[PDB]
Write a protein that binds this ligand. Structure first.
Ligand code: CLA
Ligand code: CLA
Ligand code: CLA
Ligand code: CLA
Ligand code: CLA
Ligand code: CLA
Ligand code: CLA
Ligand SMILES: CCCCCCCC(=O)OCC(=C\C=C\C(C)=C\C=C\C=C(C)\C=C\C=C(/C)C=C=C1C(C)(C)C[C@H](OC(C)=O)C[C@@]1(C)O)/C=C/[C@@]12O[C@]1(C)C[C@@H](O)CC2(C)C
Ligand SMILES: CC(/C=C/C=C(C)/C=C/[C@@]12O[C@]1(C)C[C@@H](O)CC2(C)C)=C\C=C\C=C(C)\C=C\C=C(C)\C=C\[C@@]12O[C@]1(C)C[C@@H](O)CC2(C)C
Ligand SMILES: CC(/C=C/C=C(C)/C=C/[C@@]12O[C@]1(C)C[C@@H](O)CC2(C)C)=C\C=C\C=C(C)\C=C\C=C(C)\C=C\[C@@]12O[C@]1(C)C[C@@H](O)CC2(C)C
Ligand SMILES: CC1=C(C/C=C(\C)CCC[C@H](C)CCC[C@H](C)CCCC(C)C)C(=O)c2ccccc2C1=O
Lengths: 130, 162, 73, 80, 223, 34, 30, 153, 72, 147, 171
């Protein structure tokens, strides 16, 4: 019926990925579920989970993350999202250090932090021709 | 005369003359193709016979409502286009016939979706076959009656030439 | 009224909020700023006001036109 | 890709991180507030510019600021 | 029938009420999809299967709307530019390239022949609009055969085009009320919200309410 | 060739040929790569 | 009424002004 | 490449000018003007007082012949993979080397011969236009004078 | 261009993109730039340009034609 | 998808049609261009000013030439209160016979001149279609100077 | 039975296996078309497409053009033929520029394998990537396709003009 046994029991929708997620990048979300719960696809309609390993492919990181946020309502937490380039170039994305970004984990450095409030930003006229 | 679709209650596996008891699978596929094509053509022919009799809007009226008379009144350049269209359709059907998993009368390719056919699918195929058979008998009767009497279906019925 | 609708349909909330800022400055200067802080209509409400005024103006124009024309003749 | 900056007015309430639809922001250790945490933007290449992050910011004039910049198929939200 | 103001007012009022109520029905369908729709309870049913191929529906409705608008309105514009250029024989008129609504005239003929043939117990046609005699009360016309020519063809196709575009806006609102390729979690933002932000190139009016707003505009146009 | 033939020589030339070549050049330029 | 020579040389001078325009256009860079 | 192509066209056009002079002299080249009722108002040149002067039918026929030749050229242009000599240079191809002041004196059907004859024909067209502009006669009149009288006879 | 904003035109464009990508005899032709809806500022500019051009053209036509047709 | 917005690398990396749209609308915002200095800014503005003045002079020369060639300036001199000035002739293949007849003025369909150039040029002392041609020639020369 | 299933057993594609996308009739009909017919060089595909397209393109121009005639007119036929030929020229220009800006390949179905085997550590998009393996997806292939479209369009337009003249004269 389906290419892989771990795919959710989805009947296919004309809202899945397109030619872009065959030559630029595609995103895969994996998770393990205790029950074959019925959930709503980020793209189309209702799909059925597998009582075990579940693997879904999407065209955007936002679609995978919306599916994962929906999974949290099913008490599912072990979901992990990967980015796949045109060949099998798998990169773990969402649980980047194994801890969700909302929980503080040691080993993270601040990126994009300014040691002042908004009012300390430089005047644009002094940022001309650089 | 097999596990083929088309066996109905009045006469199950209707092969009184044993045409299928000796034929192989290829000949039986040919027979099913011929039966389905004849049935479809006959359904179209019966519907056209009646509708033409009580409605012929095209050709600015004219084209006498009696069939087998309008057959010799079409501009004969519209006959050629109908012939060419039927020919192209059957060329496409021939091309379909070599697709893998082809079934005798299946030009929609339902074998792609229908694996492990149900009873509803078999019943609908039997419905199509039985309607085609009834239309074959009906169109044969129509042509013969119009030949011997000269009146069309609803004209002969209306007068009472029965 | 139909032309009035286009003010809400074409504009945006930020401009009206920033204009209300200066109006509120004047009120505070005269000690008459209301306790209920005046805010510009929300984006959805701006759209709703625009469409309601547009429909009212157009339908009323057609209403008056039809009625006057068909009563006169 | 858009630019996301975090300012030391951060109170570490995590509402920005749990509102990001594309996993751009994360909470990192800090010593400038009671919570001991500050938001970070290490994955701005996935930033879409929806600005949900600063709609959930409780600080006075924001501690996360999104500056829209060059566009990308990821930042434009193109599924095609 | 001889009180023309009453007839005109009644028709216009009832058509306006109908258009408003239809837009409201579309709005509340979208509201149901956002709020009261349960994905689990609707597994592989009609609602699920419609959402699963919403793209095909909306794309083909888009093509139909473009085809109908191009044709109806561009035939109007072609007539206008042919008249402005002094080419009266190049118009889509009766004394020119003629588009006779033959299907509607056939129906009109069928109704005026119904009494005695298909409605044998009728003494007169249901309406004189389909054909018959001029009915006048006090020297004022009550009803009369409404002839259909190339002018009625164009305006009827204009009606079809406007109705199709209104249906397009409202159906796009209903089907894309829960999710899309832009916002995969649009249902979590509710039925009534202004946007998701300036990102993705700009996500104005993606709601389903903002579709009942545009559909209200197009219903006004059509009516 | 009289002066009154110049409109019929130039108006089609400009108003049709110049769009074609300009579209060709502009499309080629804006679709270039690096 | 102006002659063919008058219009022709005006067209030729217009061509020269066109070559000067592309030189300015190309000098203002791609 | 451009010089070679323009030389070929200039030689062919010297042939075409000779043919046009012959046709004008020998009673060919249809008479009158185009029918405005048949070909629209775009063929009308002027209206002096109640009569519409239209484009001459001879001009229309000559334009149709030139359209035939130009269409052949356009086909050859969008037929690069099937023609012996292309119109434009392929990426990588390098322009043939300029022939110089005097191309090599190689008689026959040689590149140098065609090059020299194309340059000569283009110079002849330049001289013909210059003579017509300076003196003031028709182009065909100048060709007739430059052939003694054997063309428009 | 002024009343209808973006977001409503991005999803429609996505549907059109799917239709083009999933149809035979047209899959052979594909865009080099991904078709997207006009940006918010660009949409405002385009609506303003249409508004202004229509305004100027209709008033120029009216004033000129009215003067010519009324005063001989 | 590259090299069109030569002045902006951020736009040139846009994979969408937005790059083409924004390439047009940011072409004259020189201060926002990549690798930008003040000297180059003023020099480019100076050259653009020269090209602009050349465009203005070419437009005026075109008006002069079309009044001299297809107008009725000389006839309008002898009767300025009855003769309607003609801007330029019309050649449009889409015209019917009726449109040709209605727009017909003297020898060819033409547009009345609403720019008031006839009165302006008459006031400053122009009486011949050869005076207008001289002005067009001189203005094209000035445009060449500015370019 | 169900007649709609996920396409090729992939529930995540933006496509469906309906009785129209993947029906045997659709398969055969699209496989007999010049764009997908097996055994055709790109020049042959272009020639057939151009012939059919010019043949049906001369129709609307001749019938409804600016120089129509309820009777048969040689001028109307010539006008329609010229309009059809110029439209084919415009379409050929579009094809040429599209092929110029789209592909950089001269022999496909190999370069993909070469870069999947012998590595493609280059600027990519020419060695790697490469969408489609058809011969129409090359610089040479598309050029011959456009040439065939243009020549076949001219020939088909002329043939259709001849047929129209014969039908209007001898019928
Ligand atoms: C075997 C089938 C068949 C044949 C040979 C004819 C033959 C004829 N019909 Mg006819 N007709 C048919 C079926 C047929 N009909 C059916 C089923 C209907 C009901 C819709 C009609 C309704 C009809 C009318 C109303 C009229 C005719 C008329 C005529 C005559 C002129 C041709 C014409 O205009 O056709 C017109 C045919 C149609 C408008 C409908 C044809 C629809 C076809 C049969 C279905 C699709 C065919 C498709 C291309 C192939 C199938 C695909 C797939 C199964 C492989 C001609 C004698 C005209 C006449 O002069 O009457 C005396 C006329 O006015 N027919
Ligand atoms: C591909 C489009 C196409 C085109 C342009 C035509 C064109 C034509 N058909 Mg036609 N036809 C077509 C497809 C087409 N056919 C198909 C697919 C069928 C189904 C088999 C037919 C069946 C058909 C019939 C039955 C008749 C025509 C006739 C005609 C001619 C008269 C039409 C008209 O209004 O007068 C302008 C005209 C040459 C009529 C004809 O030639 O009589 C003179 C006629 O009787 N056609
Ligand atoms: C007069 C103003 C006007 C016009 C022309 C349109 C036109 C259209 N709107 Mg609309 N719209 C308007 C005002 C208008 N709208 C307003 C004020 C609003 C605010 C509420 C909207 C809101 C709106 C929505 C929400 C939607 C539309 C849609 C549509 C399209 C329907 C499909 C169609 O007919 O395309 C055909 C195009 C036309 C009929 C326009 C004229 C084209 C001419 C006649 C033919 C072609 C000319 C030719 C190509 C010119 C070439 C020469 C040129 C290059 C020089 C169409 C483009 C729908 C859509 O996206 O399309 C499906 C849709 O969903 N509109
Ligand atoms: C959609 C609107 C529309 C339509 C239908 C027409 C129609 C027409 N115009 Mg027109 N026009 C329009 C809008 C429109 N105009 C507008 C908006 C303007 C102003 C800008 C003009 C300005 C204008 C001028 C100035 C002139 C016309 C002329 C014409 C006529 C000839 C055009 C021509 O050469 O056809 C070319 C047609 C084609 C190349 C074919 C296109 C259509 C094909 C048949 C579609 C086929 C689809 C097919 C069924 C799909 C299924 C295939 C199947 C195998 C699966 C024709 C009657 C001319 C005239 O005088 O005629 C009287 C003329 O001089 N028009
Ligand atoms: C900016 C000034 C200007 C403008 C707007 C026009 C406008 C027009 N001219 Mg024109 N013309 C001009 C200057 C101008 N002229 C000058 C200076 C000359 C002397 C050489 C002519 C000689 C001329 C002739 C001989 C004819 C026209 C004709 C026409 C009309 C059709 C267009 C055409 O065929 O152009 C053709 C124009 C030329 C061959 C001359 C070049 C025009 C100038 C020098 C270029 C100006 C460029 C401009 C500043 C910006 C260019 C933008 C570009 C990059 C896209 C149109 C009304 C035709 C007409 O009257 O039809 C009824 C016609 O037959 N013009
Ligand atoms: C300055 C701009 C301009 C000009 C000069 C023209 C000129 C013309 N248009 Mg046109 N048009 C334009 C803009 C323009 N258009 C725009 C912007 C639109 C969209 C709003 C239209 C929409 C339009 C329509 C809808 C129609 C025209 C038509 C016509 C023709 C007038 C009808 C006639 O009597 O010819 C009769 C025409 C012929 C006898 C044959 C002409 C065929 C082409 C044009 C000849 C080109 C020759 C070329 C050099 C060949 C190259 C070589 C090739 C063989 C390989 C004429 C050629 C009509 C026409 O003829 O349609 C084709 C017509 O139906 N136009
Ligand atoms: C519009 C005027 C015009 C005219 C009269 C010609 C005339 C000619 N061209 Mg030509 N050409 C033109 C414009 C023109 N071209 C343009 C604008 C282009 C660029 C697209 C070309 C590109 C071109 C090529 C690529 C070729 C010609 C060829 C030819 C010759 C074919 C005649 C023949 O078969 O002799 C018998 C003839 C010299 C062919 C040639 O060299 O002669 C056979 C040839 O291969 N031309
Ligand atoms: C302009 C003439 C002036 C004469 C004055 C009056 C005549 C007139 O008016 O003419 C116009 C006219 C007809 C003109 C017809 C013409 C020019 C036909 C030309 C056809 C050219 C062809 C086939 C070229 C083929 C070239 C090729 C294959 C070129 C090539 C090669 C080769 C050979 C090297 C091989 C290479 O091989 C490889 C490797 O590919 C490929 C390639 C491309 O390189 C009729 C006019 C009128 O009928 C009308 C209109 C109205 C009537 O009432 C009156 C008349 C009769 C007068
Ligand atoms: C191309 C050409 C003629 C082309 C003719 C063709 C195609 C023929 C066309 C025809 O067949 C058709 C189509 C149809 C026929 O019915 C009509 C004709 C007409 C017969 C002449 C060019 C003629 C070109 C000429 C004369 C060029 C002269 C250039 C000079 C002097 C340059 C000098 C400099 O380059 C230096 C030396 C140093 C630089 O630094 C400075 C400068 C000063 C720029
Ligand atoms: C080459 C040429 C024509 C060549 C024609 C060819 C090849 C035709 C080939 C054909 O295949 C076609 C195409 C078609 C076939 O059906 C016919 C044939 C025949 C088979 C004309 C040159 C024509 C050349 C001409 C007219 C030259 C004129 C030169 C002049 C006036 C020179 C003046 C000066 O020399 C002085 C006087 C003093 C100097 O100091 C200053 C200057 C100015 C340089
Ligand atoms: C003017 C304007 C405002 C400001 C409008 C405000 C603050 C409304 C003020 C309403 C007053 C305070 C009450 C209404 C007073 C009227 C006289 C009562 C209505 C008339 C009766 C007859 C119904 C917005 O907030 C806004 C938001 C989004 C898009 C466009 C716009 C916009 O155009």
């Amino acid at each position: 019926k389906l290419k892989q046994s771990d795919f959710p029991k989805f009947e296919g929708s004309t809202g899945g990925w397109l030619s872009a997620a065959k030559n630029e990048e595609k995103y895969v979300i994996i998770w393990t579920s205790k029950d074959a719960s019925l959930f709503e696809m980020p793209t189309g309609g209702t799909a059925k989970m597998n009582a075990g390993n579940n693997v879904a492919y999407f065209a955007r990181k936002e679609q995978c993350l919306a599916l994962g946020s929906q999974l949290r309502g099913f008490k599912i937490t072990n979901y992990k999202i990967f980015r796949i380039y045109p060949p099998l170039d798998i990169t773990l994305l969402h649980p980047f250090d194994g801890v969700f970004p909302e929980k503080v984990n040691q080993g993270r450095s601040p990126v994009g932090k300014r040691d002042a409030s908004i009012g300390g930003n430089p005047n644009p006229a002094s940022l001309k021709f650089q | 005369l097999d596990g083929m679709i088309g066996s109905s209650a009045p006469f199950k596996n209707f092969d009184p003359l044993g045409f299928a008891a000796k034929a192989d699978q290829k000949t039986l596929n040919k027979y099913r193709e011929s039966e389905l094509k004849h049935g479809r053509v006959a359904m179209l022919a019966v519907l056209g016979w009646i509708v033409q009799e009580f409605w012929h809007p095209l050709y600015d009226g004219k084209l006498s409502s009696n069939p087998l008379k309008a057959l010799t009144e079409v501009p004969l350049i519209g006959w050629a286009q109908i012939f060419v269209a039927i020919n192209v359709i059957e060329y496409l059907q021939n091309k379909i016939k070599e697709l893998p998993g082809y079934r005798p009368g299946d030009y929609l390719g339902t074998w792609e979706w229908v694996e492990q056919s149900d009873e509803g699918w078999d019943s609908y195929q039997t419905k199509e076959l039985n309607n085609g058979r009834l239309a074959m008998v009906a169109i044969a009767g129509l042509i013969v009656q119009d030949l011997i009497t000269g009146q069309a279906a609803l004209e002969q019925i209306t007068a009472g030439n029965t | 009224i139909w032309a009035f609708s286009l003010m809400f349909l074409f504009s945006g909330r930020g401009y009206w909020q920033e204009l209300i800022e200066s109006i509120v400055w004047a009120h505070n200067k005269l000690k008459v700023a209301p306790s209920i802080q005046p805010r510009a209509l929300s984006i959805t409400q701006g759209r709703a006001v625009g469409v309601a005024h547009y429909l009212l103006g157009g339908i009323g124009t057609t209403w008056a036109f039809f009625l006057a024309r068909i009563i006169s003749v | 890709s858009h630019t996301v900056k975090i300012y030391d007015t951060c109170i570490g309430c995590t509402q920005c991180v749990r509102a990001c639809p594309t996993d751009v922001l994360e909470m990192v250790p800090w010593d400038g507030c009671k919570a001991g945490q500050i938001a970070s933007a290490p994955r701005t290449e996935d930033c879409v510019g929806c600005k949900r992050c600063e709609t959930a910011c409780p600080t006075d004039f924001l501690s996360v600021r999104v500056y829209l910049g060059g566009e990308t198929t990821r930042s434009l939200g193109l599924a095609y | 029938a001889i009180d023309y103001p009453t007839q005109l007012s009644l028709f216009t009022h009832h058509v306006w009420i109908g258009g408003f109520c239809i837009v409201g029905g579309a709005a509340h369908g979208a509201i149901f999809f956002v709020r009261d729709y349960n994905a689990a309870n609707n597994y592989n049913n009609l609602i699920d299967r419609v959402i699963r191929h919403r793209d095909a529906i909306i794309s083909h409705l888009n093509w139909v709307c473009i085809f109908l608008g191009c044709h109806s309105f561009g035939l109007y514009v072609h007539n206008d530019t042919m008249r402005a250029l002094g080419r009266s024989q190049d118009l889509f008129s009766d004394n020119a390239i003629a588009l006779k609504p033959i299907f509607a005239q056939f129906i009109q003929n069928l109704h005026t022949l119904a009494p005695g043939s298909t409605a044998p117990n009728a003494l007169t046609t249901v309406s004189y609009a389909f054909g018959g005699d001029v009915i006048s009360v006090g020297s004022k016309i009550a009803m009369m055969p409404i002839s259909l020519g190339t002018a009625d063809f164009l305006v009827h196709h204009i009606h079809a085009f406007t109705i199709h575009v209104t249906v397009l806006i409202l159906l796009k609102g209903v089907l894309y009320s829960r999710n899309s390729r832009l916002i995969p979690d649009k249902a979590n933002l509710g039925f009534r919200f202004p946007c998701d932000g300036p990102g993705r190139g700009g996500t104005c009016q993606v709601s389903a309410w903002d579709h009942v707003f545009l559909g209200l505009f197009w219903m006004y146009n059509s009516i | 060739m009289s002066l009154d033939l110049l409109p019929s020589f130039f108006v089609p030339l400009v108003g049709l040929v110049l769009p074609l070549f300009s579209i060709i050049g502009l499309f080629l330029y804006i679709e270039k790569e690096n | 009424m102006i002659y063919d020579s008058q219009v022709y040389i005006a067209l030729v001078i217009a061509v020269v002004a066109s070559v000067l325009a592309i030189r300015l256009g190309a000098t203002l860079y791609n | 490449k451009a010089e070679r192509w323009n030389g070929r066209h200039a030689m062919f056009g010297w042939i075409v000018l000779l043919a046009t002079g012959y046709a004008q002299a020998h009673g060919l080249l249809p008479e009158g003007g185009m029918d405005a009722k048949e070909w629209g108002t775009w063929v009308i040149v002027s209206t002096t007082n109640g009569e519409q002067v239209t484009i001459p039918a001879a001009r229309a026929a000559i334009a149709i012949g030139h359209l035939h030749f130009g269409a052949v050229g356009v086909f050859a242009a969008y037929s690069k993979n099937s023609v012996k000599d292309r119109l434009l240079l392929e990426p990588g191809e390098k322009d043939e080397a300029p022939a110089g002041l005097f191309p090599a004196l190689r008689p026959g059907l040689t590149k140098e011969a065609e090059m020299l004859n194309g340059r000569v024909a283009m110079l002849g067209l330049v001289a013909l236009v210059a003579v017509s502009a300076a003196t003031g006669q028709d182009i065909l009149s100048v060709i007739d004078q430059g052939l003694g009288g054997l063309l428009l006879k | 261009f002024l009343i209808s904003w973006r977001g409503y035109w991005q999803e429609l464009i996505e549907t059109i993109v799917w239709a083009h990508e999933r149809t035979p005899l047209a899959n052979l032709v594909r865009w080099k730039d991904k078709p997207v809806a006009l940006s918010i500022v660009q949409a405002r500019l385009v609506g303003l340009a249409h508004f202004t051009i229509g305004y100027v053209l209709t008033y120029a036509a009216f004033v000129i034609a009215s003067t010519i047709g009324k005063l001989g | 998808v590259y090299k069109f917005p030569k002045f902006s690398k951020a736009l040139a990396e846009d994979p969408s049609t937005r790059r083409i749209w924004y390439g047009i609308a940011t072409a004259h915002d020189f201060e926002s261009h990549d690798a930008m200095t003040e000297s180059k800014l003023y020099q480019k503005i100076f050259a653009s000013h020269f090209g602009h003045i050349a465009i203005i002079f070419l437009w005026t020369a075109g008006n002069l030439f079309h009044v001299a060639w297809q107008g009725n300036f000389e006839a309008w001199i002898l009767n300025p209160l009855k003769v309607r000035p003609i801007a330029h002739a019309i050649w449009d293949p889409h015209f019917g016979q009726a449109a040709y007849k209605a727009f017909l003025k003297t020898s060819s369909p033409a547009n009345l001149a609403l720019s008031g150039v006839y009165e302006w040029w008459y006031t400053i002392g122009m009486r011949t279609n050869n005076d207008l041609y001289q002005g067009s020639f001189f203005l094209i020369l000035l445009s060449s100077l500015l370019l | 039975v169900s007649f709609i299933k996920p396409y090729r057993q992939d529930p995540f594609v933006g496509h469906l296996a309906t009785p129209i996308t993947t029906s045997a009739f659709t398969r055969a009909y699209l496989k007999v078309l010049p764009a997908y017919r097996p055994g055709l060089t790109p020049l042959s595909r272009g020639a057939e497409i151009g012939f059919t397209h010019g043949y049906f393109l001369i129709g609307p121009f001749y019938t409804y053009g600016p120089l129509r005639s309820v009777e048969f007119s040689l001028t109307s036929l010539a006008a329609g033929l010229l309009a059809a030929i110029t439209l084919l020229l415009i379409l050929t220009v579009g094809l040429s520029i599209y092929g110029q800006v789209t592909y950089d390949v001269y022999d496909n179905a190999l370069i993909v394998k070469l870069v999947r085997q012998m590595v493609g550590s280059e600027r990519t998009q020419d060695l790697p990537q490469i969408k489609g393996t058809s011969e129409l997806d090359t610089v040479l292939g598309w050029q011959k396709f456009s040439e065939g479209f243009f020549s076949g369009g001219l020939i088909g337009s002329i043939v259709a003009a001849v047929g129209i003249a014969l039908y209007s004269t001898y019928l």
